[PDB]
Design a protein around this ligand. Sequence first.
Ligand code: NDP
Ligand code: SF4
Ligand code: SF4
Ligand code: ZN
Lengths: 425, 154, 122, 242, 134, 49, 185, 118, 353
Amino acid sequence: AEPQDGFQGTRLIPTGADFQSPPDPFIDEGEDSVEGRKVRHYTVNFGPQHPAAHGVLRLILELNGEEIVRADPHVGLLHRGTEKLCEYKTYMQALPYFDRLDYVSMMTNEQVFSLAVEKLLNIEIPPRAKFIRTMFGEITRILNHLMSVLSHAMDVGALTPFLWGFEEREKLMEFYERVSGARLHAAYVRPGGVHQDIPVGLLDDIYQWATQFGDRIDETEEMLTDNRIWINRLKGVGVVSAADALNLSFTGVMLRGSGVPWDVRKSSPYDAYDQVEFDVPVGINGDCYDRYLCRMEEFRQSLRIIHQCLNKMPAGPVRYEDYKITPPPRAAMKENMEALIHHFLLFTKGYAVPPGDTYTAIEAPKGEMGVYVVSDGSERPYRVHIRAPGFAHLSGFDHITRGHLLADAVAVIGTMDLVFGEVDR
Amino acid sequence: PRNAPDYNVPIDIATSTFTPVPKNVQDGSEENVVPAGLISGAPMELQARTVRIYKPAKPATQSGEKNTQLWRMDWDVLGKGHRWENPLMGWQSSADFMQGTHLTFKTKEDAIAFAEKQGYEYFVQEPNERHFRPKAYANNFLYSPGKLKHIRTK
Amino acid sequence: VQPTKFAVTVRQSRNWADAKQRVIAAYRAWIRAAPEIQTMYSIPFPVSHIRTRIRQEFERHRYVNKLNVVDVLLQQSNADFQETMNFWRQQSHVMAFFKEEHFRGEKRLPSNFITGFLEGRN
Amino acid sequence: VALPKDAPNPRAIPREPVGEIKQALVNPADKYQSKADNLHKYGAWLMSCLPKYIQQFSVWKDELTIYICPTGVIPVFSFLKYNTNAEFTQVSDITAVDFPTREMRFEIVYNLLSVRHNARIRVKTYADEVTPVPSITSLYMGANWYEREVYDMFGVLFVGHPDLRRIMTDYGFEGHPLRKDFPLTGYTEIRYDEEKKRIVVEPLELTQAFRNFEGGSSAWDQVGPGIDRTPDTFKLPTPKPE
Amino acid sequence: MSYPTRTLANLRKIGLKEYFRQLLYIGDTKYGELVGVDKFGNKFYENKEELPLRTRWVDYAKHDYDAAHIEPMWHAWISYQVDTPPTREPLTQIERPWAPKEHVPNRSFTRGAYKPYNTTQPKIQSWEPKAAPR
Amino acid sequence: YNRNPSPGDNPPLEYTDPVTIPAGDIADNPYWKRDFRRNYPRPSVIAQA
Amino acid sequence: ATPAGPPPKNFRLPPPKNWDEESESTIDKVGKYFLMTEMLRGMYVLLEQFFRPPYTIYYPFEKGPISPRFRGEHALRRYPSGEERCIACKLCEAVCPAQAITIEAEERADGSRRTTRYDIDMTKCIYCGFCQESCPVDAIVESPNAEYATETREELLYNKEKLLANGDKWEPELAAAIRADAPYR
Amino acid sequence: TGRPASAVMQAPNRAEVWSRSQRPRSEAMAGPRFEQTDFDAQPRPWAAIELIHKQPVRWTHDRIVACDGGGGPHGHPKIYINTDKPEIATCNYCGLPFANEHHRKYLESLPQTSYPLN
Amino acid sequence: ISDIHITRTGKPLIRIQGGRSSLGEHTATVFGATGQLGRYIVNRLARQGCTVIVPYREEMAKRHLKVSGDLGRVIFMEFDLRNTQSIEESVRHSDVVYNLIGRDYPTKNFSLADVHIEGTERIVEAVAKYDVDRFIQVSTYNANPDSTCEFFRTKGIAEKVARHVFPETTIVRPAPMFGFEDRLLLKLASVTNLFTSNHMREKFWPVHVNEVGEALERMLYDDSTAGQTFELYGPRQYSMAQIAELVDREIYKKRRHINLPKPILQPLAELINRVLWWDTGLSRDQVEREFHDQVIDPTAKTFKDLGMEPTDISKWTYHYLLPYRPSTYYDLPPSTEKEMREERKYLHVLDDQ
Ligand SMILES: NC(=O)C1=CN([C@@H]2O[C@H](COP(=O)(O)OP(=O)(O)OC[C@H]3O[C@@H](n4cnc5c(N)ncnc54)[C@H](OP(=O)(O)O)[C@@H]3O)[C@@H](O)[C@H]2O)C=CC1
Ligand code: SF4
Ligand code: SF4
Ligand SMILES: [Zn+2]
């Protein structure tokens, strides 16, 4: 009989406090005396004006000398109301909003929204689209790890690998511009497949880059992996146990670094990841050094997947073949009545999506990215909620940093793959 | 005082030169009604403005009745501030933050319940219904005992 | 408390006696903090002027007779209090709370019918 | 330029011709019927184990949703965390949806993950403007920020939450932007004023007003009613003739 | 980064005057074949033995060189969007009497900067008052 | 070898837009048989009753 | 943590090894420590890069590569006769994800369906190509141009005059880009 | 705010507006924002209405004529135009003039036509 | 006060009152808007959606003015006061013109008469040529053409020229204004030593620059301010010494003035102005100006006529000088016995770190 039952406050609702069980005491392991003197902490604001590791980050820390007492990240400096805007857009019009969430991982961001909409559309995309999206997925994973690992290396003082690897970014950004017409915000992966087919000379150009990328990974490992300064900066820093990582909502490398073998591409396969072979790097100490080694090995497995996609690329259409969902080819639209109508309706009204809801998750470069979409049967989504892995990771910053040195905070900010378009949305 | 406008209502930060003077702002003492408009964070203006609750009529240009199924809640356009011409580009500026907002309800009791809870003034427009009359194809060819009175053309 | 400086765990009031104590407790913390609020945001008003605003904010909700609604207002008050006593708000946020510092004035509605009519709906 | 001896031009290799491509028509919902029975049985067993709080369950394709009353939030999630046949030890996501036509306008949606069983579950409860929900922060640390987001965007209180404050909106922001009745551009906007030498909030004024093309929605329903896929083990028996 | 043998060779192919002038704008010692000239007077060169993306380059006609001075079709060529230079590009031969005759550079920061305006009439017309005589 | 020729000089006539013959036939493909959007599964709901 | 079923073979790590049991000689261990062998190896890598060709191009004398699909400055196009391609369908105004396009239209003096206002707010436009994809006559296109930074924001409010002039200037690129990519569109 | 011909002429090839809601350039480029400005530097594309009417009439004997703009896939959707009325038929996309040969003598009789006829 | 304003020449201005995007309808030119006071009139007009024409000399100096208005509202014009074309290109579209052009010192290029008398005369002649509705001419307190002081004298003739060419000229006589970026409060609060040949005994009635800017706006709205004259001053008389007392009372620093005698300081003040290239705050006509004492005309309109009540400068010293009071821990007053006792509840060194 809520909420009038609350008008006069009967039957308080049970909290988690009302279910605290006393531990079993048998097996439970857990004057002007100067010991009673209190210690005053000083509270320091870090960011966003004063330089931080990266992004729009106001990090408010309570310190005891050099040690972190409380860590309090203030976010929303990049909260742009993306989730509300999506309710005033068609599904086509909302797709570019996903490029701008994790804005170094554009195609996998648009991949997760395409898969969720495809699920409510009840359509199976063509095999060539599946292989193109998987291929661009691992190209985007390398682009992300190049940004993440190297800028994390640059934050702790290692200038040079960032320069070397961003030329690799330039080469892979050319592939993004060749398929779409953009360096970053491709809007390439759409529900139904991909916008347009790849130009006839792209696969060989990707292959030529693939023959030399292993050396680029190796030269990066020459400066960091065995370097004793790098090890002393990362080993034993930002430790989280396997049990707490699950309870903190950690996904991806932040979870696999603590020993849990789990990859969304393996557990719930999507696109063509069931048709490709790859290994999952897993750490054992749950620290920044293990997470660095997992990400370096993910470079090699991504390249290994890309080579398989180059050889397994099938022929056929790249867009689902129903002009009620995907736009017809321009020659069809100018030729026959049916195609022109379907072109007109898809670009003014949009396609109608059957009502319902779904939670769809992928293994994004920064961990489990998910999207929760509610369809009301119309051409605009009723609700779009985005699950960003960086949001859960930064929410754990206090748990992993309390009691530790202020001089290790830059290491764990970089060990979390943190882009604040993901965090704030 | 029987629909008198309360010229002494406290303002908030969204009160503008285009905000109408309210009659009845919620205080949290109304009988049996949750005072959402008191705690929602919405400006005072929404308790001063009137919403329309209606079933949208079928467009005269189409036979589809999909958009007549639900109840619509819409804000009436004010005398000033709804639109004006921007001198630079000729674009259409607005001071009405509710101009592009509408709410959809399964039943009008739902729409009325939401409007009472937020404190909107509302006006309910009942839908005009069709008057049933049976139609028969054979009536195009009835025998006329007298002067034809009209010449049919299929 | 434990999470951050002025953090208050969200709890329902048990009864109207419980609620009244919290409301008076909330008011007491607010008007006590008024001297600090002035010097912390360099407000160009006396503590008297600030403390009057506190009472009016509590007087807008004096007539509430619903326990659940009070719990909502109490939670809002704690959230506003924490983000003020922690220097999380900026001078722009607190200054916007004082309705006098808008360049169109504080009497932002017409006094009566004929002043609003002569100016054009206010 | 100096070419590599064993790297020939990959464009110069002719490709085998492609002719009449044939792709079968696939209904993507068919592959989930293999587990449709098991998902209903799991939902039914949960309802039998917690009948006091579980009102209904639904199975769509491979997604199982559990519908519960707000008071059972702690008992139900305890069971999903600790039961040996339900080890949903991670909260993937907590969010809300607004339905103004409902008396309880806010639908609270929890998505859980069980790594051990490689499974996911959805739990739905409901809330109001003045009716709180139990916080699950005592069972899941990751839930802390998700509940702050729900409180920030929707105004839903979580009793037992430590430090329930805004996470996304500006300090002193008024309103809950993900409510359907909250307008897209909100109520106010900021600028720098050269007299006050600081930023000032002012009533919102758009040089070009937002243009809502919602009225272009199709005058005809375009999806239809769909297909019933309830398994036979969860449909009632029928009386035989005679 | 030229290297000694590259710079020494290009010096011999171009001379010290040209070498120093090239060092005054591009800051490198480049030599190649003249692909063509655009309407503004920019000279375009190709050399396929250079480093990738350095095989095409422009010598600007104007001391205050700006990237917007490049003729449109040549802009495609130097950015590797096409391989056929405008000298052999048939689409550059279609006669469009409306086409701008002189080159259009970026006019920002000058008094030729583009000024926007409403291109339509007012949506409403007031009455023209006509006091009827008594 | 690299980006040679430039994609802007790929001969347009060579590339063929592919059509899969069940979905793209002119003879034996009625739309309703491949209309998998309108054959979407309804959620299967079980209440306590 | 582990999947249900029996523990993965050899998932459990063997017990830690003591200092005594390390399979690495003292002289090697002491030598690497005092001589910093892996740091010397990393320095040697830099010298190898010091003698490799740099990747730098000398912009604006040289340019990076762009494709026929590249999305830059907007333009309005004509037919070979010079008639406007635009017929005021409003498809680009409807699909625009950012509401950057504003259009007004009536019958022209000759009775043709043409626009009277065609504005693009370049400070609202997200450069996504949706208008160019939605146009049934190839009227709105994105040119390859990207070098049009302006002194004032008002210079980025393009009206129909600015857009038709852009199409007149850039037409040979616009036709070449359409020529190369139209088979894939 | 404009004395020069670029500031008054609606287009280089047409002085007058070609639609009723078109703002005349003389009023559009007037006001404070056009004070210290070069007017020849302003974008002034040619009027499309004047250019299309220089196009000669494409004569045909067939009653129905197809038009797609002439670019194949690079033009507009293919439409079919009826030439049975004794007048110049115009494509509703590209504005191209078409006429049947049956009406040539009456069209040649006409004092002035919308299109050159030759 | 309404949606209709009819201008001197009759133009009806249907106005939509609001903020940045609204329609104020007025087109204003503000000469000398790049100075201390020009920011408060430009800001007030632009934020009401009025078009403000800003003639400028240095581009980097006027950059802050654009923020006031919406797109297309603040318009900049390159101008020289001896370029007539530039003055009247900036004015021919305006319905109100503010003349805020003044200078307290002579320069190599402009005598006080060149910038004030000849400056006004070119502007006022432009105003009458295009029939601008309101020409508000800003002047000085003590403006009198019979004064020995060239400042006051050249502000006197320019009043007479403006009123002759344009009889409806509105003259505003502000007293020395304080406020943000003023030359009263911060000059006292900042410079280590002042060369004042009068022991800071000159008296005047300081008025907030904000109120002067607001007053200028209020004259636009009422047509009754044309052909009028406005002395604009604060409530209470002060002297440079008494205001310096307030300044010192707020920044905890002691003022030190050398006070060289007039026959020696005045020629030196001339030399410094002719060899240093900036406003030194010191010049021959400025030393003479400090012996003069602000005398308020009794036959001139005041803030009363505009519905305003000026605030006293002592109400504003703390606000405007707060960022200049030291806040180092070294400078707090000694700890109370309450403070001495609580210190013994804390450890004051981390021995483990
Ligand atoms: N401030 C005060 O206390 C008092 C001021 N006044 C009068 O008030 C008005 C405004 O005062 P305030 O804003 O403080 O003065 P400022 O000195 O701060 O600004 C004066 C303005 O005049 C312009 N200017 C000066 N000389 C010339 C010139 N030769 N040619 C063109 N422009 C010129 C300046 O432009 P630029 O920045 O390019 O130099 C500047 O914008 C002036 O008329 C002044 O004389 C009178 C009494 C008291
Ligand atoms: S540009 Fe193309 S899509 Fe937009 S109105 Fe013109 S014809 Fe229609
Ligand atoms: S590029 Fe995208 S955002 Fe820009 S005008 Fe075209 S559709 Fe709109
Ligand atoms: Zn045609």
